RNA sequence: UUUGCUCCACACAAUAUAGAUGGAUACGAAUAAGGCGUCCUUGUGGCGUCGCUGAACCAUAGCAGGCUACGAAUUGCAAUGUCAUUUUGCGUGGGGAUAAAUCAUUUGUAUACGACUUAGA
RNA sequence: GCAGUCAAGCGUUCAUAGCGACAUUGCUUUUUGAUUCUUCGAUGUCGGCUCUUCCUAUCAUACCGAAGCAGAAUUCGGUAA
RNA sequence: AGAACUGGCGAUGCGGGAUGAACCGAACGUAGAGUUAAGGUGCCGGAAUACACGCUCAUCAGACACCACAAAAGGUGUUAGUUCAUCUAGACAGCCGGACGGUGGCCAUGGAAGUCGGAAUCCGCUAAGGAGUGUGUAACAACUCACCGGCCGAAUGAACUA
RNA sequence: GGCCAGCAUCAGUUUUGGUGGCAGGAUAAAUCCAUAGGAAUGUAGCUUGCCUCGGUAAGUAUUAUAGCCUGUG
């Protein structure tokens, strides 16, 4: 219900996140995918790298600047898998694809704003333990993405700075959890435990 | 040799007499006891007091609670109603916060409108009496 | 089919601990500190004794028992590499050209280097791994020794010395040379 | 499939010469009383000289269970037509009733041998009375003394499509 | 010749809606494993509790919410009940800034023409 | 066209280091034979010069394996356009 | 290329088979509602990221009959099953001990006790060990081992089917 | 004095809920109660190596300081 939904994408399946985003962004929910380099995808590495070197081959053989534009970033791979699932040739598809932004890592527009997680698309809920997954960052670097070191440095420099925010918040939280847990014994709270809250 | 730190997980094992809870179906949300297993996926449940009959149900409908009480294999409804009351399971269950939270969650959707507004009045006093004291 | 449980157990000798959590197994024993990650096989360890430790897989479907037995024997070998170690004794064979193997202290590793192998003039380079202790034999002048803690290093280094001494486009059943592992003994026996 | 184990009695029509032909009995597994009779007249037609218009279905009776709250070690015998050559088989079920064992007979028979319901004859469904004669490993691994096992990876069912926190799967 | 032109103001009027009417409420990582709290011989620690739905958490008392410290009936049995927000013009008062490019002409490191490249108070 | 399946016998008594019959089975459109579906109010017809891209059933180059493989050249195949 | 019977297409739109003259459903005045047919319900795309039992992980998987192709033959890759079966009087294994003396039983002889080889075959000790299964010395040696025995107390070898 | 909306009582075609009455069935089967019989995936007591009071074991015994099934009412 929040108008800009920040879907975290650590260990989501690619197709199962693409479908539940392409249905949600067709109805107006401005969805921004964040950390789309940690996306996972079914099957092993040497099957999906083959299914991408079976896709780089397809190009217009009278002028190569016309046919399938093989975007090789792990943002734009999910973007291709969403462009397949909406009808981007129409105008409803264009005004629905404008409602979606896809990032690798976390840019500081979306630093301190809440990440939500799609439950029906998670790897830990949708694979069998024992099958082989594939990290999309591990795939795109093999197929020609030059931007792993920049995103890894720019992301863990964010994580080490975020941990001290969490250390401040965990100190602030037990102030309230010490004030109220020494003040919940009163009749103001016993008049509410008869009301459920 | 000095002590070894070996730990993986502390499961709630489906065993004989495991107090299990129906989560889906017509009689969902009332306690039951696993009498004996049948296959990998379906067990035989029998809960006398809570109202459920003696059935053979999937493990998909059921939810294993951590509290267990003893019984022999293949127990009938009479013997499990004896062991149930003698082990006092329906009293031991409500002491867990899971039952406390499930009763609170039952109560909140059972509130009427004036009982919601008195909550709205009473939630203007707790923080008003607490949040001045932290300075 | 689906199983319910099969189990193996690891039997620790005197002096060694096993500190395991989240499928990283560990040994701090009388000689070494072997940390070995196991982060892709969904095994479950549980301590029954200070002398032996249960390691059991549940149902799985018989593609898991082949994992449970090898993950038992992996920790068995990882323990016995610290209790008694491994010691591979390799030996030169040469028909006419006397082989020269020595070490060098390069700016990378301690690069063990072999030359004069069937009269070749390219001086070959082999790196050493970390725990692999390399030494010579001063009773027979044709024998070298690898030792250490982890089997996937102390045998892999003998593999790296026995891979590159490969005869190219001549008969292997006529020109039989190279260095060969003979005695896979232990470091205390 | 909600099966219902039926008991059917059939007889030839009474001839003026012999007005007492023998009543034949079958106890079959069928979904209702119509395919009950139509699977009766297909089984009896393989054995004796009678068609549907030459005999009368004397009696239909459902056979409710003798104890429907008891785990029984069923040993079912069966024959089935493959895509090349018909075969005899003997499976092992461990369900609670004869009505609910033949369903999971048909399900895993159609799963492991791809035989549909039109190719299978259920021969004999016998509750094995003890633990000695049963020799199927997928039951001898279930009947063990004081068996415990855990369910290691319990996934969560979901109701909404935006979980605000990372899921826990621990059971 | 502050006729010009832009920056702040609310002053008016007008303009486009991919569709705001309580709150996008921030650790990270593993899921056959974790979070939070206590204690210590600060650990892959001894101990306790917890998840089994965010159905949560915060705010919501007053002319869509006023004076002081009563006020809103008779928008008549429903008739959006407008308050959104990126733009722009015109007028008022308050500061600020004092240029470039193109053609023509020339050059040959360029050239079909356009273009590129230089030179000229 | 031979890519696969059974391979008498031969290569000095030495069945698949290889080859060669009896003969079974299924590819290929690149031949020709077949029918006559598309223009008989015309799709310009062979061959060469020129020029680009593609296929693999590899002639050479790369890396291997196995060869009654001393070397050397051969010969037998595998990945590979 | 030529007949037989029915239905169709020609003359015929509509919902389904991605589009397709013949297939599937159905035949049509204009309108509103409900219900379905055939077909489907991740998303494009109206509709269960519904339930239940199984099997597969393919370095060219597989997904709606007509249909837009797939064989003969092979793979302990997995799964279920059939029928003999050695064998708790310790099977096969896995580590370990013996393989003995009667007797070099006879021919090829330049040199062959079992062994470049050939016509060929009885007994003691027993717990068991073949004039003998190969390596070998020009020959005698020395191993191997089906045959038993020490340990094991677990069973399992074998062909075949879908 | 019309048109356009709202609500109520009707009528037709529906579509979606909660509850009751009656019958049929092995006059449902079950569970429940009573008796007999039996067995092990053996519940107490009893020989049995210290430990922790039968715990270790596997014999003994078939309802005892748990219970199970079969046959009947």
UniProtKB/Swiss-Prot annotation, chain A:
Entry's localization field: Cytoplasm
Cross-referenced PROSITE patterns: RIBOSOMAL_L13 (PS00783)
Record PTM N-acetylserine, positions in chain: 1
GO cellular component: cytosol; cytosolic large ribosomal subunit; nucleolus; ribosome
Cystine bridges: none
Statement: the UniProt record of this protein carries the keyword Phosphoprotein: yes
Keywords: Acetylation, Cytoplasm, Isopeptide bond, Phosphoprotein, Ribonucleoprotein, Ribosomal protein, Ubl conjugation
Listed InterPro entries: Ribosomal_uL13, Ribosomal_uL13_CS, Ribosomal_uL13_euk/arc, Ribosomal_uL13_sf
Pfam families named among the record's database cross-references: Ribosomal_L13
Entry-linked HAMAP family: Ribosomal_uL13
Extra remark: There are 2 genes for uL13 in yeast.
Family: Belongs to the universal ribosomal protein uL13 family.
PANTHER family noted in UniProt: LARGE RIBOSOMAL SUBUNIT PROTEIN UL13, RIBOSOMAL PROTEIN L13
Name the record gives this protein: Large ribosomal subunit protein uL13B
Species assigned in the record: Saccharomyces cerevisiae (strain ATCC 204508 / S288c)
Curated annotation (Swiss-Prot), chain B:
Record's subcellular location: Cytoplasm
InterPro entries recorded: KOW, Rib_uL2_dom2, Ribosomal_eL14, Ribosomal_eL14_dom, Translation_prot_SH3-like_sf
Primary site of residence: cytoplasm
PTM notes: N-terminally acetylated by acetyltransferase NatA.
Function: Component of the ribosome, a large ribonucleoprotein complex responsible for the synthesis of proteins in the cell. The small ribosomal subunit (SSU) binds messenger RNAs (mRNAs) and translates the encoded message by selecting cognate aminoacyl-transfer RNA (tRNA) molecules. The large subunit (LSU) contains the ribosomal catalytic site termed the peptidyl transferase center (PTC), which catalyzes the formation of peptide bonds, thereby polymerizing the amino acids delivered by tRNAs into a polypeptide chain.
Family to which the UniProt record says this protein belongs: Belongs to the eukaryotic ribosomal protein eL14 family.
Note: Present with 45300 molecules/cell in log phase SD medium. There are 2 genes for eL14 in yeast.
The protein's name in its UniProt record: Large ribosomal subunit protein eL14A
Protein's organism: Saccharomyces cerevisiae (strain ATCC 204508 / S288c)
Lineage: Eukaryota, Fungi, Dikarya, Ascomycota, Saccharomycotina
UniProtKB/Swiss-Prot annotation, chain C:
GO MF: rRNA binding; structural constituent of ribosome
InterPro entries to which the protein is assigned, alphabetical: Ribosomal_uL6-like, Ribosomal_uL6-like_a/b-dom_sf, Ribosomal_uL6_a/b-dom, Ribosomal_uL6_CS2
The organism's place on the tree of life at top rank: Eukaryota
Keyword Cytoplasm found: yes
Main localization of the protein described in the UniProt heading: cytoplasm
One GO process term, biological-process aspect: cytoplasmic translation
Signal sequence segment: none
Disulphide bond pairs: none
Subcellular compartments: Cytoplasm
Short name of one Pfam family: Ribosomal_L6
Keywords, in A-Z order: Cytoplasm, Ribonucleoprotein, Ribosomal protein
Cellular compartments per GO CC: cytosol; cytosolic large ribosomal subunit
Homology family: Belongs to the universal ribosomal protein uL6 family.
Task performed by this protein: Component of the ribosome, a large ribonucleoprotein complex responsible for the synthesis of proteins in the cell. The small ribosomal subunit (SSU) binds messenger RNAs (mRNAs) and translates the encoded message by selecting cognate aminoacyl-transfer RNA (tRNA) molecules. The large subunit (LSU) contains the ribosomal catalytic site termed the peptidyl transferase center (PTC), which catalyzes the formation of peptide bonds, thereby polymerizing the amino acids delivered by tRNAs into a polypeptide chain.
Note: Present with 52400 molecules/cell in log phase SD medium.
The protein, known as: Large ribosomal subunit protein uL6A
Species the sequence originates in: Saccharomyces cerevisiae (strain ATCC 204508 / S288c)
Gene (name only): RPL9A
From Swiss-Prot, chain D:
UniProtKB keywords: Cytoplasm, Isopeptide bond, Phosphoprotein, Ribonucleoprotein, Ribosomal protein, Ubl conjugation
HAMAP family: Ribosomal_eL20 (MF_00273)
Superkingdom of source: Eukaryota
SUPFAM superfamilies cross-referenced by the UniProt entry: RplX-like (SSF160374)
Sites of the Glycyl lysine isopeptide (Lys-Gly) (interchain with G-Cter in ubiquitin) crosslink: 124, 130, 148
Gene Ontology biological process terms, A to Z: cytoplasmic translation
Function noted in UniProt: Component of the ribosome, a large ribonucleoprotein complex responsible for the synthesis of proteins in the cell. The small ribosomal subunit (SSU) binds messenger RNAs (mRNAs) and translates the encoded message by selecting cognate aminoacyl-transfer RNA (tRNA) molecules. The large subunit (LSU) contains the ribosomal catalytic site termed the peptidyl transferase center (PTC), which catalyzes the formation of peptide bonds, thereby polymerizing the amino acids delivered by tRNAs into a polypeptide chain.
GO cellular component: cytosol; cytosolic large ribosomal subunit
UniProt-recorded Gene Ontology molecular function terms: structural constituent of ribosome
Residues recorded with modification Phosphoserine: 31
Compartments reported by the entry: Cytoplasm
Protein name: Large ribosomal subunit protein eL20A
Additional comment: Present with 54300 molecules/cell in log phase SD medium.
Family to which the UniProt record says this protein belongs: Belongs to the eukaryotic ribosomal protein eL20 family.
């Amino acid at each position: 219900s929040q108008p800009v939904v920040v879907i975290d994408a650590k260990d989501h399946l690619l197709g199962r996140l693409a479908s539940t985003i392409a249905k949600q962004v067709l109805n107006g929910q401005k969805i921004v995918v964040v950390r789309a380099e940690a996306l996972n995808i079914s099957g092993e590495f040497f099957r999906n790298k083959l299914k991408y070197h079976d896709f780089l081959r397809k190009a217009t053989a009278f002028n190569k600047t016309r046919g399938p534009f093989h975007f090789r970033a792990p943002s734009r791979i999910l973007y291709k898998a969403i462009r397949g699932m909406v009808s981007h040739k129409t105008a409803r598809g264009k005004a629905a694809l404008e409602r979606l932004k896809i990032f690798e890592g976390i840019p500081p527009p979306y630093d301190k704003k809440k990440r939500v997680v799609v439950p029906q698309a998670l790897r830990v809920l949708r694979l069998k333990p024992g099958r082989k997954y594939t990290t999309l960052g591990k795939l795109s670097t093999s197929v020609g993405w030059k931007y792993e070191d920049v995103v890894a440095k720019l992301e863990d420099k964010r994580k080490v700075r975020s941990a001290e925010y969490y250390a401040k918040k965990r100190a602030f939280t037990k102030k309230v959890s010490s004030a109220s847990a020494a003040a919940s014994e009163s009749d103001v709270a016993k008049q509410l435990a008869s009301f459920g809250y | 040799s000095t002590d070894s730190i070996v730990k993986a997980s502390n499961w709630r094992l489906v065993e004989v007499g495991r107090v299990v809870l129906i989560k889906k179906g017509q009689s969902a949300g009332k306690l039951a006891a696993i009498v004996e297993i049948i296959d990998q996926k379906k067990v035989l449940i029998d809960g006398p007091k809570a109202g459920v009959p003696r059935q053979a149900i999937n493990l998909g409908q059921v939810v294993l609670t951590p509290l267990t009480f003893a019984l022999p294999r293949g127990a009938r409804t009479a013997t499990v109603s004896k062991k149930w009351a003698a082990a006092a399971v329906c009293e031991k269950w409500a002491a867990s916060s899971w039952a406390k939270k499930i009763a609170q969650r039952e109560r909140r959707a059972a509130l009427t409108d004036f009982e919601r507004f008195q909550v709205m009045v009473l939630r203007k006093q707790k923080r008003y009496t607490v949040k001045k004291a932290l300075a | 089919m689906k199983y319910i449980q099969t189990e193996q157990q690891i039997e620790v000798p005197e002096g060694v601990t096993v500190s395991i959590k989240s499928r990283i197994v560990k040994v701090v024993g009388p000689r070494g500190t072997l940390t070995k990650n196991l982060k892709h096989i969904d095994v479950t360890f549980t301590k029954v004794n200070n002398q032996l430790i249960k390691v059991a897989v549940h149902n799985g479907g018989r593609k898991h028992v082949a994992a449970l037995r090898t993950v038992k024997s992996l920790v068995d070998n990882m323990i016995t590499g610290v209790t008694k170690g491994y010691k591979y004794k390799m030996r030169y064979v040469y028909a006419h050209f006397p082989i020269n193997v020595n070490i060098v202290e390069k700016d990378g590793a301690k690069f063990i280097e072999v030359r004069n192998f069937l009269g070749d003039k390219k001086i070959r380079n082999v790196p050493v791994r970390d725990g692999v202790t390399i030494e010579f034999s001063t009773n027979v002048k044709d024998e070298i020794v690898l030792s250490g803690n982890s089997v996937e290093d102390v045998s892999q280094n003998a593999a790296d010395l026995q891979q590159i001494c490969r005869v190219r486009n001549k008969d292997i059943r006529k020109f039989l040379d190279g260095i060969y592992v003979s005695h896979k003994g232990f470091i205390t026996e | 499939a909600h099966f219902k184990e039926y008991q059917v009695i059939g007889r030839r029509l009474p001839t003026e010469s012999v007005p007492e032909p023998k009543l034949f009995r079958m106890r079959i597994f069928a979904s209702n009383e119509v395919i009950a009779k139509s699977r009766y007249w297909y089984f009896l037609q393989k054995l004796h000289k009678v068609k549907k218009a030459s005999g009368e279905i004397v009696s239909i009776n459902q056979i409710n269970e003798a104890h429907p709250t008891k785990v029984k070690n069923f040993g079912v015998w069966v024959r089935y037509d493959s895509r090349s050559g018909t075969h005899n088989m003997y499976k092992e079920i461990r369900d609670v009733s004869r009505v609910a064992a033949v369903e999971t007979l048909y399900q895993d028979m159609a799963a492991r041998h791809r035989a549909r319901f039109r190719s299978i004859h259920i021969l004999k469904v016998a509750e094995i009375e003890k633990t000695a004669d049963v020799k199927r490993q997928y039951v001898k691994q279930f009947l063990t003394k004081d068996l415990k096992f855990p369910l290691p990876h319990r996934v969560q069912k979901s109701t909404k499509t935006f979980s605000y926190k990372r899921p826990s799967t621990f059971y």
